């Protein structure tokens, strides 16, 4: 009768095995007798519970037993848990909750994990998210850190709305046990919810990597791609939308492979299929793979109608699996879209009635299922008012019902306003649109309706309303309206100063916005020929001729199957004009052939294209036909001018002259005819007809607003007569008259660079001012001032950052397209080398001549025609490159260049002279006698290309270097005579100075036959008469010192040269040297000290060196 012994024997039989548990006579009998002998041994009732639970199955009594066990021992979590679990299995939730509450009320601090989990899971199953949240925090603070609680907390936090601590809980669950995927999926779901679809897509791809069959990830990817496609469709990007739709459909069918019973996937597939409506037919071709198209066969390509049919099928399947009003309305909308597509293309009519009936039935069923949704009512109304049905009473009823269902309904209000507006109800349509605008300030359709009403009433702010509408959300109607209004406003030519054209078309920059608007519109619709012509016209205004030609071509293709009287012929003519403007003369001729040549415009365009291609006779014939047709006399005068131009192009200048005279005799001359006559007179050497035409232009023509052209014509008039000085005077007068107009300053700089290049400082100043005055003239201005600085030499304050090299580099940076800049760069590099040699510090910028020559040739090759100027440019560039290579010491490269040039074409004297110099650089560098045969060859080659001073000076130098004083003197005299005859001035001075130097050298050799001093004196006197040459006065001083030596006068002359300011450093140094010499001969120590300190105030070393050297005799 010991309860404990009976208990332990019962346990023994329980643990012996399943067979002893199944024998009812041992386990049960001992547990029941023990429980009868001692009723407080709760564990015995617990074990009776286990026996009856697992062997007998009487759950209700078992629950009661576990309850008594827990009442006897409230620490037995096992009995309590089993009682709760059986109560939940018995649907007795009140007892389970009472137990759980008693436990958690006694659990002051944790130690109730099982009960917290029970209550939290139960409340999560129910709609009690707040209580579930509370229980989850308590369970989490219980002590266990397992994920299964963190994930529950995160899910409840997401359910209530919080997005921060949910992410924290999901992150914690992932970090403590990564094997779970649900937490990462929920993180990606949160990322998707708050926009930023791309990050969610990346997370979903990463999740799908590890496991390829997770349905939620495929659904998320499909939804993200659908939303991105819709966002792309908000703008006008049809290709992006189509690609996103295809990807979303692929993901949706991939998910449907695994779970085919889910209405969500079917409805999402239907939505994706039907989303691509009213998007550029013949641009939608979608790849759908596998099971969707009947039998599983690879991948197939579907069109718009097939895609819509597939969407309808998917909607039907989703409806079959789940009947909901939302899917009914979606099916109705899908059928409505299908009917719209069938009607739009004109494929059929009156055979779409079945689709409309199906859509109406589905929408009516949906709206009757729940008559409290503004969406269903509005959809029913919109579908009812379709042109194929036209049930306006039902549409009005549905719109009123949708308005009544929810007060803030801008869509229904604007639909009602549109219905009233199209049925001639301006006032009430305005009222409804105003109501919609007040209820929603950022709705586009109401604004478009207001703009349409304003246009229908003829207001003044219709253009501004359309512009604001286009700026807001890029809708098609506002786009077309704004484009049409801008084109019409531009077309009228009497508005130029009415302050409406000015403000409308200049401060708002209407043309580029209209161009972009029309591009988007033509992308969306692409079946409107007027839109194509408007786009072409706008592109013409923007100098976008290729786009204009393409638009005209597409308009032509669209318009071929039309009435063809005005639209198609004008399209052909515009396409031909644009095509001719961008080369393609044969295509322009063909385009102008395919039209009736009975209108002035077509005939004149044909004539211009013919002239551009050639065929001057046919051009003249067409111009004569236009002249026969012409009216609007200004046009007749222009036709006469064109006829004169083409006649001149055929030679035969007399008939062109008579045509221009005929144009002049007309009642009122035109500026173009007079300018053409003056230029034609300039082309010939008459120069008197040009003066008369210029007088005519000056007399009674002032409305012309181009001072540059008139100044250029006058300058050319003056330059033709060979004066060459009055050009600068005329341009200076023009600049004085108009201090602005940077073109005049640039012209002045260029003209002083070319003619009369002695005002080099003025030219540099004019170029700098022209560059300052504006920005787009900087290129030419900098080129001209660089050349003027090159002409000056080094007549500055030796300041950096302002030399010809810097300015030419700036010009090269501004526009690296012309060859003259590269040639000037070569010249500047050579001049800098010479300057560095003079200063004797370092040679720099040694070897770039080949690259610059190649650049010059490449940039020359791409100009239309400047033949003589191009030839001179290429000759100068080649000669300068050869000379620079010779100077630097790359004789082999120079010889290869010369040989290639002479192999390319038969010989020309300049290149043979260059080759002679190349060959003769090595020989005679070191002292060596040369055969008289070589001397005769050199003399013959110099004779080959005469009338060039450089070659004569070089041959004189060669003669002197070998030694021929008479021959060198003769050559210098010949060069002097040639330079004086040819009108040059620098060459005359150079010849004088070179002859003086040679004769002074020969006199310094103390030779007899004292005629060389006479030559020195005459040359120096002539040079001094020419200009103020410090070198000439110094040569005079050297000769005078050599003769007398002792004579006091010589010291006076030397002191004048060394003491008068404005002299170069080297000449002053030489004069100082000889003055010190003369005074040391004259033995005056005070003057020697004066010389020493004078040398010390300036910078010198040689004078002080010789002073010290002769001080210590």
């Amino acid at each position: 009768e010991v309860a404990e012994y009976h208990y332990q024997l019962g346990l023994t039989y329980w643990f012996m095995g399943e067979e002893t548990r199944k024998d009812k006579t041992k386990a049960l009998t001992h547990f029941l007798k023990a429980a009868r002998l001692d009723t407080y041994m709760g564990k015995v009732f617990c074990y009776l519970g286990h026996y009856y639970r697992d062997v007998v199955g009487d759950k209700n009594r078992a629950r009661g037993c576990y309850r008594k066990a827990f009442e006897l021992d409230d620490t037995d979590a096992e009995s309590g848990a089993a009682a709760v679990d059986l109560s939940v299995e018995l649907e007795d939730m009140e007892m389970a909750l009472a137990i759980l509450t008693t436990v958690t009320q006694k659990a002051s601090a944790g130690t109730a994990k099982w009960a917290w989990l029970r209550r939290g899971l139960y409340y999560l199953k129910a709609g009690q998210h707040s209580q579930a949240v509370a229980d989850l925090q308590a369970a989490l603070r219980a002590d266990p850190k397992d994920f299964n609680c963190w994930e529950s907390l995160g899910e409840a936090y997401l359910s209530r709305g919080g997005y921060t601590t949910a992410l924290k809980s999901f992150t914690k669950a992932s970090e403590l046990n990564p094997e779970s995927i649900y937490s990462v999926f929920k993180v990606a779901a949160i990322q998707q919810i708050l926009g930023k679809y791309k990050e969610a897509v990346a997370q979903y791809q990463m999740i799908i990597k590890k496991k390829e069959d997770y349905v939620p990830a495929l659904k998320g990817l499909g939804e993200c791609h659908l939303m991105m496609a819709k966002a792309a469709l908000v703008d006008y990007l049809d290709g992006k939308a189509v690609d996103y739709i295809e990807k979303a459909l692929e993901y949706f069918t991939c998910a449907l492979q695994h779970r085919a019973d889910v209405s969500c996937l079917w409805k999402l597939a239907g939505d994706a299929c039907t989303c691509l409506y009213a998007v550029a037919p013949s641009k939608v071709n979608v790849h759908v793979l596998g099971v969707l198209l009947g039998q599983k066969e690879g991948k197939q390509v579907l069109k718009k109608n097939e895609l819509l049919h597939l969407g309808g099928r998917c909607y039907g399947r989703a409806l079959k699996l789940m009947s909901t009003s939302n899917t009914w309305c979606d099916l109705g909308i899908n059928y409505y879209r299908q009917a719209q597509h069938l009607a739009e293309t004109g494929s059929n009519m009156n055979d779409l009635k079945e689709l409309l009936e199906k859509s109406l039935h589905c929408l009516k069923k949906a709206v009757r299922l729940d008559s409290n949704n503004h969406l269903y009512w509005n959809a029913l109304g919109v579908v009812a008012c379709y042109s194929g049905i036209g049930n306006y009473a039902l549409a009005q009823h549905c719109f009123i019902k949708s308005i009544q269902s929810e007060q803030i309904n801008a869509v229904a209000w604007t639909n009602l306003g549109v219905l009233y507006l199209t049925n001639e109800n301006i006032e009430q349509a305005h009222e409804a649109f105003k109501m919609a605008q007040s209820l929603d300030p950022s709705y586009l359709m109401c604004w478009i309706g207001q703009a349409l009403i304003a246009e229908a009433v003829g207001s003044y702010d219709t253009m501004d309303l359309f512009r604001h509408t286009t700026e807001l959300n890029m809708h098609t109607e506002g786009a077309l309206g704004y484009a049409y209004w801008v084109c019409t406003t531009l077309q009228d030519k009497s508005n130029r100063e009415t302050e409406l054209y000015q403000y409308n078309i200049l401060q708002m920059n209407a043309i580029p916005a209209a161009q972009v608007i029309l591009n988007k519109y033509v992308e969306r619709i692409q079946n409107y020929a007027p839109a194509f012509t408007m786009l072409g016209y706008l592109n013409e205004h923007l100098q976008l001729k290729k786009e204009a030609a393409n638009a005209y071509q597409r308009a032509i293709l669209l318009l071929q199957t039309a009435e063809d009287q005005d639209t198609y012929n004008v399209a052909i003519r515009n396409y031909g004009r644009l095509l001719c403007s961008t080369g393609e003369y044969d295509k322009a001729i063909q385009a102008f052939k395919s039209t009736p040549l009975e209108v002035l415009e077509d005939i004149i365009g044909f004539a211009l294209a013919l002239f551009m291609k050639g065929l001057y006779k046919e051009s003249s014939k067409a111009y004569e036909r236009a002249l026969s047709i012409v009216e609007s006399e200004q046009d007749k005068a222009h036709i006469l001018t064109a006829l004169a131009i083409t006649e001149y192009k055929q030679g035969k200048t007399d008939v062109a002259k008579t045509l221009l005279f005929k144009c002049s005799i007309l009642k009122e001359p035109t500026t173009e005819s007079l300018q053409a006559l003056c230029a034609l007179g300039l082309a010939m050497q008459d120069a008197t007809l040009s003066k008369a035409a210029l007088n005519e232009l000056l007399k009674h023509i002032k409305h012309k607003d181009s001072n540059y052209q008139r100044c250029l014509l006058t300058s050319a008039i003056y330059a033709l007569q060979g004066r060459s000085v009055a050009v600068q005077k005329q341009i200076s007068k023009a600049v004085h008259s108009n201090p602005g107009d940077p073109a005049l300053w640039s012209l002045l700089s260029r003209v002083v660079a070319q003619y009369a290049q002695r005002n080099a400082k003025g030219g540099v100043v004019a170029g700098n001012v022209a560059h300052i005055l504006d920005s787009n003239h900087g290129k030419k201005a900098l080129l001209y001032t660089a050349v003027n600085q090159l002409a000056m030499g080094s007549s500055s304050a030796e300041d950096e950052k302002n030399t010809a090299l810097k300015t030419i580099q700036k010009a090269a940076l501004l526009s690296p397209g012309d060859p003259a800049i590269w040639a000037g760069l070569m010249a500047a590099c050579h001049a800098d080398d010479k300057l560095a040699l003079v200063n004797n510090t370092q040679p720099k910028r040694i070897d770039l001549y080949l690259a610059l020559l190649s650049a010059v040739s490449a940039s020359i090759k791409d100009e239309k025609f400047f033949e003589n100027y191009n030839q001179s440019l290429e000759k100068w560039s080649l000669s300068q490159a050869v000379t620079g290579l010779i100077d630097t010491g790359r004789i082999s490269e120079a010889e290869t260049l010369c040989t290639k040039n002479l192999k390319s074409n038969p010989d020309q004297p300049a290149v043979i002279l260059l080759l002679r110099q190349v060959q003769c650089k090595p020989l005679l560098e070191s002292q060596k006698p040369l055969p008289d045969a070589v001397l005769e060859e050199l003399q013959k080659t110099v004779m080959s290309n005469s009338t060039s001073v450089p070659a004569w000076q070089w041959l004189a130098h060669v003669y002197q270097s070998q030694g021929m004083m008479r021959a060198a003197e003769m050559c210098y005299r010949k060069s002097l005579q040639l330079a004086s005859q040819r009108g040059s001035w620098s060459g005359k001075l150079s010849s004088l100075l070179r002859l003086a130097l040679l004769a002074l050298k020969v006199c310094m050799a103390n030779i007899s036959n004292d005629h060389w001093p006479s030559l020195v004196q005459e040359a120096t006197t002539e040079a001094l008469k020419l200009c103020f040459c410090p070198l000439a006065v110094l040569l005079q001083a050297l000769l005078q010192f050599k003769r007398k030596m002792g004579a006091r006068e010589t010291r006076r002359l030397l002191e004048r040269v060394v003491y008068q300011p404005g002299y170069p450093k080297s000449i002053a140094s030489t004069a100082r040297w000889y003055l010190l010499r003369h005074l040391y001969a004259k033995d005056d120590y005070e003057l020697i000290d004066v010389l020493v300190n004078n040398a010390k105030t300036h910078g010198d070393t040689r004078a002080l060196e010789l002073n010290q050297r002769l001080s210590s005799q």
Binding site: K657, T658, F661, S664, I665, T688, L689, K691, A692, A693, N695, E696
Partner: peptide
Amino acid sequence: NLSLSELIAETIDV
């Protein structure tokens, strides 16, 4: 100092 009218007249005559 020949003006336009004289030039036209002279050329027309010849």
